[PDB]
């Protein structure tokens, strides 16, 4: 009677953006990203990918409430680098790693026959 729908986890409304960027003014060259309709699956992947770059000084995420399907991420970078470009770089790197993983799994599965 107060239970929301189980499909609001993934169905993006038309008035709700997928992604929203605001800057953290306290420290230089830092941004706060809120990902709507996502959870730990994307958050942990991105966080541990970004944490290994030399030019990334701060990266973290949290899910403020388990009953709401979003997370917020704080990311800081050095002076020359922009956190957004590093975010695209991390996304592309994980995509390439997954493509290589898929190719090797398919070849291995064929060889196993």
């Amino acid at each position: 009677m107060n239970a929301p729908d189980r499909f609001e986890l993934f169905i993006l409304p038309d008035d709700v953006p997928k992604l929203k960027i605001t800057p953290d003014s306290r420290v230089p060259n830092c941004i706060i990203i809120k990902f709507e309709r996502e959870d730990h699956t994307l958050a942990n992947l991105l966080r541990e990918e970004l944490a290994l770059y030399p030019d990334v000084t701060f990266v973290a995420y949290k899910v403020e409430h388990p009953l709401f399907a979003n997370f917020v991420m704080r990311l800081q970078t050095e002076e020359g680098t922009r956190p957004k470009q590093a975010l695209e770089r991390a996304c592309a790197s994980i995509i390439n790693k997954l493509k290589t993983l898929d190719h090797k799994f398919n070849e291995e599965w064929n060889i196993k026959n």
Partner: protein
């Protein structure tokens, strides 16, 4: 579950017989803004079922 990292502590784990008791929140949740009053005292009536 969130990170796949091992937990530093080990967890007591196994099956246990649990029971579903008759007390459900949906049988208890009640709110009232305005509603029926008593004839004699003209004060809010008594009862979740009576609002």
């Amino acid at each position: 579950g969130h990170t796949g990292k091992k937990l530093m502590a080990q967890v007591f784990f196994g099956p246990t017989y649990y029971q579903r008791l008759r007390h459900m929140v949906d049988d208890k949740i009640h709110a009232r803004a305005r509603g029926p009053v008593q004839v004699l005292t003209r004060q809010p009536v008594e009862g979740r079922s009576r609002d």
